[PDB]
């Protein structure tokens, strides 16, 4: 479609001002809203870009085919960069969003100055002896099933796994709520695209500099994957966050804001 429509479909909003722009991409089951505690801190010095995946960024409004693989999601990112008429932008992505950002940069690397990956994973499958995704093919298949047979029950089960912080319920209920509010068929398509994707082979093709924020006590993306990505991504830096779980941008906005801000102040 044309500029205005892309802007409509991906709920594109621009805030702040600066010579450079930082584009924030939601992880699974989330909308731009997950960035409320982190993104405004960069409006002072950068044009800040927020958006939702038409592939139901935890919301309504779409073509079946394009969102069966993450490429469709990377195509949204490209489409928005195009509607905004951007020449270059920093890209901040969470979980799948990071990978989605990665795939898009491989297609159009000139479009991205940096790839800040909060909690990435290039593959969730455990693959001894060289790779430990953190999941057994059957565990993933287990959740996908739970997701169909009973969606809402899954929304809560998974919200707990992702946060892995029993004494931080407000966040968990918010995550659970975000999951519940997302169309269950698309949620499942998205999850399949994410859980069964394998992008290890693609790591070597990334030419855009990336910062890997690995979380602590992360069941979704264990330390294994963060290190492994650092090892295979040609141009990267790996910072271990003190924050626990898979959603630092929600549970530890401040540490997230610092790490991201340092990294950028540095690489100007």
From Swiss-Prot:
Entries under InterPro entries matching the protein: AB_hydrolase_1, AB_hydrolase_fold
Pfam families per record: Abhydrolase_1 (PF00561)
Induction (record text): Induced by entry into stationary phase, but not by carbon and energy starvation.
Active site: 95, 218, 246
One GO MF term attached to the UniProt entry: pimelyl-[acyl-carrier protein] methyl ester esterase activity
Superkingdom of this protein's organism: Bacteria
Function: Positive regulator required for energy stress activation of the sigma-B transcription factor. Could be required for RsbP phosphatase activity.
Family: Belongs to the AB hydrolase superfamily.
Protein name: Sigma factor SigB regulation protein RsbQ
Native source organism of the sequence: Bacillus subtilis (strain 168)
Taxonomic placement: Bacteria, Bacillati, Bacillota, Bacilli, Bacillales
Gene: rsbQ
């Amino acid at each position: 479609g044309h500029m205005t429509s892309i802007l409509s479909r991906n709920h594109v909003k621009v805030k702040g001002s600066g010579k450079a722009s930082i584009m924030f991409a939601p992880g699974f089951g989330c909308d731009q809203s997950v960035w409320n505690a982190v993104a405004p801190a960069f409006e002072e010095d950068h044009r800040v870009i927020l958006f939702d995946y038409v592939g139901s960024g935890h919301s309504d409004l779409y073509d079946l085919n394009r969102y069966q693989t993450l490429d469709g999601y990377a195509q949204d990112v490209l489409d928005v960069c195009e509607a905004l008429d951007l020449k270059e932008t920093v890209f901040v992505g969470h979980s799948v969003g990071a990978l989605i950002g990665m795939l898009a940069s491989i297609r159009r690397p000139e479009l991205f100055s940096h790839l800040v990956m909060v909690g990435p994973s290039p593959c969730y499958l455990n693959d001894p002896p060289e790779y430990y995704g953190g999941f057994e093919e059957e565990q993933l298949l287990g959740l996908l099933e739970m997701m169909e047979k009973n969606y809402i029950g899954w929304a809560t089960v998974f919200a707990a796994t992702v946060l892995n912080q029993p004494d931080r319920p407000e966040i968990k209920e918010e995550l659970e709520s975000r999951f519940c509010s997302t169309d269950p068929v698309i949620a499942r398509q998205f999850a399949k695209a994410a859980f069964f994707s394998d992008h290890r082979e693609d790591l070597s093709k990334v030419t855009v500099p990336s910062l890997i924020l690995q979380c602590a006590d992360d069941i979704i993306a264990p330390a294994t994957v963060g290190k492994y990505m650092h090892q295979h991504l040609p141009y990267s830096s790996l910072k271990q966050m003190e924050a626990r779980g898979h959603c630092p941008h929600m549970s530890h906005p401040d540490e997230t804001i610092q790490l991201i801000g340092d990294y950028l102040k540095a690489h100007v």
